[PDB]
Structure 1
Amino acid sequence: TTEVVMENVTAFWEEGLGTPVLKDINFKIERGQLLAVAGSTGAGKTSLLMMIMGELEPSEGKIKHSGRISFCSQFSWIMPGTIKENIIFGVSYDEYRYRSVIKACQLEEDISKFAEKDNIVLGEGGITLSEGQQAKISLARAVYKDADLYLLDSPFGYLDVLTEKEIFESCVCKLMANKTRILVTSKMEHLKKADKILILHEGSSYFYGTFSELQNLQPDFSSKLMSFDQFSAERRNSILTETLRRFSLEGDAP
């Protein structure tokens, strides 16, 4: 596994009056630790992860890690073929690794709904899963793939999936306990159980540290966000956006 180091990092989006997508980003994450990244819509959570992978070039500062990454996108995707083929996806088959992954990702119930189990063909002529089941497969695919560093721009966080709590506890927390990983998340339980948390807004880091430090350093912010996890993904992201937007020389009425 690996360590991730960011030091005074600034980047601009090359493709496609506000300029940099990410500004003065500073964090270290120890081997086997979890970073929870939370923040407003368009803060730059996906782009931070892009930058770690090499998809985005920094104009300032250093990025350090081993360079063996598995990335999960926030958009569920499915290749034509079996559920099993979608999780394995060109990677060497191991029955114990696969089983523990599909268990952690809460797919065992879904799979057993089918007569062919995980050998059911998904696609054009086959069957179509719910966006929720497709999210579980997508995370499983990214987690089954072996890596030093796991960038989870989780599809949950923009979905309301009944069994997400179980995914986070079993997969991200326990199955992946010895992996260095980064979870983009809109849930407060995830921030509480993380080793480190990062709050991003308009390209900037408005907080980096632990949940304890957050609760202590910014209590008014904390009390506004920490039953919050019972709200829908769309609603939680709104409240977060609304709250983060107060960090300015105005801050509107509602």
Structure 2
Amino acid sequence: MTPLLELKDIRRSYPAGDEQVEVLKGISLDIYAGEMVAIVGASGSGKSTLMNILGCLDKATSGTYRVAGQDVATLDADALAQLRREHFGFIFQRYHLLSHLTAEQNVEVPAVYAGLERKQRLLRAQELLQRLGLEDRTEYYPAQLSGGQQQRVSIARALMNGGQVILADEPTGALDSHSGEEVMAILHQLRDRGHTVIIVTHDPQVAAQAERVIEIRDGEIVRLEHHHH
């Protein structure tokens, strides 16, 4: 089809006088709407820097990145943030919840910066927590919730502005196996409903649940593999 995200010759280095340290060394990759892709590699491989570029939280040194047709290098910080909110939701190994906000209040947060009014933010945040199986927990503080529950809150939060593309960094890394499998089934279900899910992981067993696997070694794509379930 036509791709949702397009990367061509993406490079990233951190300046150190005139020895650059090269973290990404020319990555070309296309990602489509409605698929699950895993990026797999050891620590220091560049996978996390690649994620941050996908999410528009970092800028490539060179190369081209387009999101739904729009080249990100042309945009100022306000326009980029807006683009980010139109397309992306984020989850991590840690839950990144504010301890003194309820689950619902936590979910609402990203919509604040989309200009969304409080009555409307509240409604949508409750709908998403219900979808995630937490209808009874909307007023619980994170201290009162398990790890598994906290991650479901983080997923709802990732959908608040749409979450067309979910970027997930090692989302089961801090979870027992049952909670891990719940999270993965939720991600498969979002993909079935048309979301793109991108998972970064050091673990090839987590990666094997995706439709495509990209292996990164020393800042380069070393292998690309298709899977089916």
Q: Tell me the equivalent position of 2:92.
A: 73
Aligned to 1:229: none
- In 1, distance between residues paired with 2:88 and 2:15? 23
Q: C-alpha displacement at 1:14, in angstroms?
A: 5.0
* 1:12 to 2:28 alignment: no
> Is residue 36–residue 191 contact of structure 2 (8 Å, CA) maintained in 1?
no
Q: What secondary structure, in the 3-state scheme, does the structure 2 residue paired with 1:21 have?
A: strand
Give the equivalent residue in structure 1 for 2:107.
Answer: 87
Give the structure 1 partner of residue 223 of structure 2. 207
- Give the superposition deviation at 1:21: 1.2
Q: Which residue of 1 aligns with 2:130?
A: 99
Structure with the larger strand share: 2
Residue of structure 1 equivalent to 2:188: 173
Q: Which runs of 4+ in 1 moved over 6 A?
A: none
The equivalent residue for 1:46 is 48
Q: How many percent of aligned residue pairs carry the same amino acid?
A: 21
The count of aligned residue pairs is 194
What's the counterpart of residue 158 of structure 2? 142
- Residue by residue over 1:62-84, the C-alpha shift from the partner in whole angstroms, topping out at 9 and shown as x without a partner, is 11113422222333212122122
Give unpaired runs (5+ residues) of structure 2: 69-82, 112-120
Q: TM-score, normalised by structure 2?
A: 0.71
Do the aligned partners of residues 96 and 132 (structure 1) sit closer, same or farther apart at CA in structure 2, a change above 3 Å counting?
A: closer
- For 1:139 and 1:9, how far apart are their aligned partners in 2? 28
Q: Is the 8 A contact 1:23 1:204 kept in 2?
A: yes
Q: Deviations over 1:193-252 (max 9, x none)?
A: 32211111222222123148xxxxxxxxxxxxxxxxxxxxxxxxxxxxxxxxxxxxxxxx
CA deviation string 1:4-59 (max 9, x = no partner): 111111111359x8821112112111111111111102222221111123332223
Between stretches 174-183 and 157-166, larger displacement belongs to 157-166
User: Are 2:183 and 1:152 equivalent residues in the alignment?
Assistant: no
CA distance in 1, matches of 2:91, 2:153: 11
Classify 1:157/1:44 alpha carbon distance in 2 versus 1 (closer, same or farther; 3 Å).
farther
**1:128, CA displacement in angstroms?**
5.1
Give the conservation status (yes or no) of the 8 Å contact 1:25–1:204: yes
- The structure-2 alpha-carbon separation of the partners of 1:161 and 1:58, relative to structure 1 and needing over 3 Å to count, comes to same
Counterpart CA distance in 2 for 1:211 and 1:26 is 20
Shift of the 161–192 alpha-carbon distance from structure 1 to 2, 3 Å rule, reads: closer
SS at match of 1:70: strand
* Offset, 1:189: 4.7
SS in 2 for 1:25: strand
Query: How many Å apart are 1:176 and its aligned residue?
Result: 3.4
Q: Distance in 2 between matches of 1:204 and 1:77?
A: 30
Q: How does 1:117-132 map to 2 (within 5 A)?
A: 117-122=137-142, 127=143, 129-132=145-148
Contact kept in structure 2, 1:157 and 1:186, CA below 8 Å: no
